Write an enzyme that holds these catalytic residues in place. Structure first.
Site, PDB file in Angstrom:
ATOM      1  N   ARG A 283       0.773  -1.222   0.000  1.00 32.50           N
ATOM      2  CA  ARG A 283       0.000   0.000   0.000  1.00 32.50           C
ATOM      3  C   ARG A 283       0.814   1.288   0.000  1.00 32.50           C
ATOM      4  O   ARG A 283       0.431   2.317  -0.537  1.00 32.50           O
ATOM      5  CB  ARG A 283      -0.934   0.000   1.181  1.00 32.50           C
TER       6      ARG A 283
ATOM      7  N   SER B 182       1.451  -7.954  10.555  1.00 31.27           N
ATOM      8  CA  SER B 182       2.200  -7.220   9.565  1.00 31.27           C
ATOM      9  C   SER B 182       3.460  -6.784  10.255  1.00 31.27           C
ATOM     10  O   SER B 182       3.425  -6.175  11.332  1.00 31.27           O
ATOM     11  CB  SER B 182       1.524  -5.967   9.118  1.00 31.27           C
ATOM     12  N   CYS B 183       4.584  -7.117   9.643  1.00 32.45           N
ATOM     13  CA  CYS B 183       5.855  -6.868  10.280  1.00 32.45           C
ATOM     14  C   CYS B 183       6.917  -6.253   9.400  1.00 32.45           C
ATOM     15  O   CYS B 183       7.258  -6.807   8.352  1.00 32.45           O
ATOM     16  CB  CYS B 183       6.318  -8.222  10.881  1.00 32.45           C
ATOM     17  N   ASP B 184       7.411  -5.071   9.704  1.00 27.63           N
ATOM     18  CA  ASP B 184       8.555  -4.517   8.998  1.00 27.63           C
ATOM     19  C   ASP B 184       9.748  -5.059   9.784  1.00 27.63           C
ATOM     20  O   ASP B 184      10.052  -4.579  10.892  1.00 27.63           O
ATOM     21  CB  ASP B 184       8.473  -3.030   9.086  1.00 27.63           C
TER      22      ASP B 184
ATOM     23  N   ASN C  75       8.916  -4.026  18.496  1.00 28.20           N
ATOM     24  CA  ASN C  75       7.838  -4.886  18.958  1.00 28.20           C
ATOM     25  C   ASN C  75       8.284  -5.977  19.908  1.00 28.20           C
ATOM     26  O   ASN C  75       7.557  -6.235  20.864  1.00 28.20           O
ATOM     27  CB  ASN C  75       7.145  -5.590  17.819  1.00 28.20           C
TER      28      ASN C  75
ATOM     29  N   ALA D 279       8.445   3.866   5.467  1.00 24.72           N
ATOM     30  CA  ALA D 279       7.455   3.874   4.395  1.00 24.72           C
ATOM     31  C   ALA D 279       6.138   4.234   5.022  1.00 24.72           C
ATOM     32  O   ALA D 279       5.789   3.549   5.988  1.00 24.72           O
ATOM     33  CB  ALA D 279       7.342   2.516   3.816  1.00 24.72           C
TER      34      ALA D 279
ATOM     35  N   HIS E 290       8.125  -8.815   6.358  1.00 23.59           N
ATOM     36  CA  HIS E 290       8.739  -8.259   5.164  1.00 23.59           C
ATOM     37  C   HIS E 290       9.914  -7.352   5.315  1.00 23.59           C
ATOM     38  O   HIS E 290      10.110  -6.793   6.384  1.00 23.59           O
ATOM     39  CB  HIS E 290       7.668  -7.530   4.394  1.00 23.59           C
TER      40      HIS E 290
ATOM     41  N   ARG F  97      -7.740 -18.504  28.353  1.00 18.80           N
ATOM     42  CA  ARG F  97      -8.451 -17.399  27.737  1.00 18.80           C
ATOM     43  C   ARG F  97      -7.866 -16.062  28.159  1.00 18.80           C
ATOM     44  O   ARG F  97      -8.587 -15.067  28.056  1.00 18.80           O
ATOM     45  CB  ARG F  97      -9.928 -17.426  28.151  1.00 18.80           C
TER      46      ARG F  97
ATOM     47  N   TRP G 179       5.386   8.023  16.069  1.00 20.90           N
ATOM     48  CA  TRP G 179       4.038   8.048  15.565  1.00 20.90           C
ATOM     49  C   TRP G 179       3.677   9.393  14.994  1.00 20.90           C
ATOM     50  O   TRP G 179       2.487   9.649  14.793  1.00 20.90           O
ATOM     51  CB  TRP G 179       3.007   7.718  16.674  1.00 20.90           C
TER      52      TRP G 179
ATOM     53  N   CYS H 182      -0.725  -3.429  13.891  1.00 19.48           N
ATOM     54  CA  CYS H 182       0.186  -4.442  13.364  1.00 19.48           C
ATOM     55  C   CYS H 182       0.384  -5.551  14.376  1.00 19.48           C
ATOM     56  O   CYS H 182       0.379  -6.741  14.074  1.00 19.48           O
ATOM     57  CB  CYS H 182       1.519  -3.898  13.098  1.00 19.48           C
TER      58      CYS H 182
ATOM     59  N   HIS I 132      16.829   2.241  20.341  1.00 20.95           N
ATOM     60  CA  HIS I 132      16.408   3.356  21.161  1.00 20.95           C
ATOM     61  C   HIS I 132      15.298   3.063  22.190  1.00 20.95           C
ATOM     62  O   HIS I 132      14.123   3.363  22.013  1.00 20.95           O
ATOM     63  CB  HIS I 132      16.022   4.456  20.168  1.00 20.95           C
TER      64      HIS I 132
HETATM   65  C1  UMP Z   1       3.087  -1.732  12.393  1.00 23.97           C
HETATM   66  C2  UMP Z   1       3.434  -1.053  13.670  1.00 23.97           C
HETATM   67  C3  UMP Z   1       4.175  -1.994  14.545  1.00 23.97           C
HETATM   68  O1  UMP Z   1       4.055  -2.031  15.780  1.00 23.97           O
HETATM   69  N1  UMP Z   1       4.947  -2.957  13.862  1.00 23.97           N
HETATM   70  C4  UMP Z   1       5.135  -3.047  12.480  1.00 23.97           C
HETATM   71  O2  UMP Z   1       5.941  -3.826  11.975  1.00 23.97           O
HETATM   72  N2  UMP Z   1       4.275  -2.273  11.737  1.00 23.97           N
HETATM   73  C5  UMP Z   1       4.325  -2.103  10.316  1.00 23.97           C
HETATM   74  C6  UMP Z   1       4.340  -3.249   9.295  1.00 23.97           C
HETATM   75  C7  UMP Z   1       4.129  -2.596   7.935  1.00 23.97           C
HETATM   76  O3  UMP Z   1       5.426  -2.367   7.414  1.00 23.97           O
HETATM   77  C8  UMP Z   1       3.475  -1.259   8.312  1.00 23.97           C
HETATM   78  C9  UMP Z   1       1.962  -1.340   8.467  1.00 23.97           C
HETATM   79  O4  UMP Z   1       1.393  -1.277   7.138  1.00 23.97           O
HETATM   80  P1  UMP Z   1       0.143  -2.186   6.779  1.00 23.97           P
HETATM   81  O5  UMP Z   1      -1.037  -1.822   7.611  1.00 23.97           O
HETATM   82  O6  UMP Z   1       0.551  -3.555   7.071  1.00 23.97           O
HETATM   83  O7  UMP Z   1      -0.195  -2.113   5.366  1.00 23.97           O
HETATM   84  O8  UMP Z   1       4.032  -0.888   9.619  1.00 23.97           O
HETATM   85  C1  UMP Z   2     -12.521 -25.536  20.958  1.00 21.22           C
HETATM   86  C2  UMP Z   2     -13.377 -25.838  19.805  1.00 21.22           C
HETATM   87  C3  UMP Z   2     -12.558 -26.017  18.633  1.00 21.22           C
HETATM   88  O1  UMP Z   2     -12.870 -25.667  17.498  1.00 21.22           O
HETATM   89  N1  UMP Z   2     -11.357 -26.629  18.855  1.00 21.22           N
HETATM   90  C4  UMP Z   2     -10.861 -27.026  20.083  1.00 21.22           C
HETATM   91  O2  UMP Z   2      -9.776 -27.584  20.172  1.00 21.22           O
HETATM   92  N2  UMP Z   2     -11.566 -26.619  21.205  1.00 21.22           N
HETATM   93  C5  UMP Z   2     -11.250 -26.891  22.603  1.00 21.22           C
HETATM   94  C6  UMP Z   2      -9.957 -26.446  23.216  1.00 21.22           C
HETATM   95  C7  UMP Z   2     -10.056 -26.776  24.678  1.00 21.22           C
HETATM   96  O3  UMP Z   2      -9.644 -28.117  24.854  1.00 21.22           O
HETATM   97  C8  UMP Z   2     -11.559 -26.693  24.907  1.00 21.22           C
HETATM   98  C9  UMP Z   2     -12.149 -25.330  25.047  1.00 21.22           C
HETATM   99  O4  UMP Z   2     -12.000 -24.975  26.463  1.00 21.22           O
HETATM  100  P1  UMP Z   2     -11.425 -23.590  26.912  1.00 21.22           P
HETATM  101  O5  UMP Z   2     -12.280 -22.465  26.552  1.00 21.22           O
HETATM  102  O6  UMP Z   2     -10.101 -23.377  26.290  1.00 21.22           O
HETATM  103  O7  UMP Z   2     -11.276 -23.561  28.396  1.00 21.22           O
HETATM  104  O8  UMP Z   2     -12.117 -27.199  23.717  1.00 21.22           O
END
Ligand code: UMP
Ligand code: UMP
Ligand code: PFG
Ligand code: PFG
Lengths: 264, 264
Positions: free
Chosen positions: B21, B167-169, B177, B263, B207, B127, B80, B146, B51
């Site tokens: 892009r 997405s990773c530069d 990151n 970029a 990339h 979770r 930023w 990203c 830095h």
């Molecule tokens: C996003 C910001 C960050 O924390 N880390 C990153 O690597 N970037 C990047 C990846 C890409 O070069 C650009 C995001 O552009 P796009 O949305 O992926 O098209 O910054």
């Molecule tokens: C979720 C459903 C699916 O598509 N694939 C899966 O493997 N499961 C699983 C993962 C885990 O064993 C359990 C979900 O329990 P929890 O929310 O992670 O605690 O079923």
């Protein structure tokens, strides 16, 4: 499949014993990635028999936006019964998030149609994502999303997909999740006229439940047979228009089934 | 670091040319994972001097729930500046989604307080997630997240974290990151009386921009040094009360800077 049985040996070999939400106990590792090149064959495990009918109907149900198991019952599929309420509802899980993510200003975003649009008109986008992890609706879901977030990518005219799965039951759930996303990549690729590329699986908590260890050592003593081939027999006018009959899985000769209990 | 330079070499050896892009040109790969064992040292790269003032003030600006570039200017952090509007605002980017995810009914979820109380009260939960990928507000952000989604894990009194970076530069953003999320695990583990475990990094479109080939070749012939060590001087009363002068980096002896264009 070679990658699957190697993941299984790794959680046995590097796994930590943990208690969990269901009170069953798991062995788990955190962080793993594996790649399936879908030009080598359909990734359906052969070292135990998998039920294709369930894998296909759950995908179709998801692509309809549905979250109630009536559909799955009309088609004799019971994989989601222990989590549905008295009415068959599961809450705003996958189908609703994919097809109608609720925004704050009262709109709803269909994420699958957006991705299909991106794949056509801007395949070099680094934003081609579907998320089911909707923080504001998590409390209304019967089970939180295990397959949480996925990204598409186009490279030498081949479509690829990477999934981040935050929780993974390796024995029971993961053969279903690998074949489901593989099927989605072939359906997205047929609609965009792209060749199929790789499915990349990434895992968060990748575990084997303590009541699945005999089954695991059984399976692990078996040799992968040749991978099956998927034949799609029709090109429908949209991704939401596929039927069960359009899919033929050819050449699948698996080892016998291994029954195991689901932890609820 | 070895992991970092091998990924840099892999992009040059295996990347596909893409028009992106920005219109600058990129060599990309899709799908990579690296893990850093935080017991082995702080993963700040040493093959070019990084830095740290920018890395820590950006992470404290995020945990304050701020999306306005004002706080960073007060501390002379410039990273930023070119995506910010005339008023200094970026839209609801990272800080707004971490601390105040807007629900469809007018409420707000503070995902960072939820994660604190989950790690202190339910460490085994599969979770423990914070997501920045809020599909309902994507079109309102100056640049789409990203570093999109991360998850924490606790196993034997140790805290790990996995990031999904969509997405990773590689030359410019990825150094930053990695150290950001490393720092976050240290602050989280200190507030939760846990030891630190692994930082697992997973990428989507990974990339190397076209106008960074020389700087990459110059960085690829330097030897990585021993990793520094991170000292946190006082224990604040919450994850929200840390301050720049609270952190120390001992043993950091980097190779000189390497200046490169971003970029837009
Ligand atoms: C996003 C910001 C960050 O924390 N880390 C990153 O690597 N970037 C990047 C990846 C890409 O070069 C650009 C995001 O552009 P796009 O949305 O992926 O098209 O910054
Ligand atoms: C979720 C459903 C699916 O598509 N694939 C899966 O493997 N499961 C699983 C993962 C885990 O064993 C359990 C979900 O329990 P929890 O929310 O992670 O605690 O079923
Ligand atoms: C991933 C995924 C999708 N899910 C959801 C889901 C929800 C919560 C979870 N919770 C949890 N702890 N682990 C999970 O992995 C998990 C998964 C899900 C997947 C698999 C099972 C599961 O129990 N898998 C078993 C049984 C499959 C079954 O339901 N299939 C039918 C098979 C019937 C049959 O063989 N039919 C043949 C017979 C032919 C003839 O008539 N004879 C046929 O149809 O051809 C069943 O047992 O009723 C397995 O894979 O072995 C449950 C849920
Ligand atoms: C990740 C992250 C945080 N960001 C934000 C962000 C926004 C858009 C982007 N766009 C893009 N194509 N790639 C990115 O990596 C990217 C990153 C970000 C990171 C690094 C630089 C960057 O330009 N880094 C340079 C210069 C650092 C600088 O500000 N440092 C002081 C030096 C003071 C001394 O002397 C300065 O130049 O003022 C570098 O690391 O070489 C910009 C933005």
């Amino acid at each position: 499949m070679k990658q699957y049985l190697e993941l299984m040996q790794k959680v046995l070999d590097e796994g930590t014993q943990k208690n969990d939400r269901t009170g069953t106990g798991t062995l788990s590792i955190f962080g793993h990635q594996m790649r399936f090149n879908l030009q080598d064959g359909f990734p359906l495990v052969t070292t135990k028999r998998c039920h294709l009918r369930s894998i296909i109907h759950e995908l179709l149900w998801f692509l309809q936006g549905d979250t109630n198991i009536a559909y799955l019952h009309e088609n004799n599929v019971t994989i989601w019964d222990e989590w549905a309420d008295e009415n068959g509802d599961l809450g705003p899980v996958y189908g609703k998030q994919w097809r109608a993510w609720p925004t704050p200003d009262g709109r709803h975003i269909d994420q699958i149609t957006t991705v299909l649009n991106q794949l056509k008109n801007d395949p070099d986008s680094r934003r081609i994502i579907v998320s089911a992890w909707n923080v504001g609706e998590l409390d209304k879901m019967a089970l939180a999303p295990c397959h949480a977030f996925f990204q598409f990518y186009v490279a030498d005219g081949k479509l690829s997909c990477q999934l981040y799965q935050r929780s993974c039951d390796v024995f029971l759930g993961l053969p279903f999740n690998i074949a489901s996303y593989a099927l989605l990549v072939h359906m997205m690729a047929q609609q965009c006229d792209l060749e199929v590329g790789d499915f990349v699986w990434t895992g968060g908590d990748t575990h084997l439940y303590s009541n699945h260890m005999d089954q695991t050592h059984l399976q692990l003593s078996r040799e992968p047979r040749p991978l099956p081939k998927l034949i799609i027999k029709r090109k429908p006018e949209s991704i939401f228009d596929y039927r069960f009959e359009d899919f033929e899985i050819e050449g699948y000769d698996p080892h016998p089934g291994i029954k195991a209990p689901v932890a609820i």
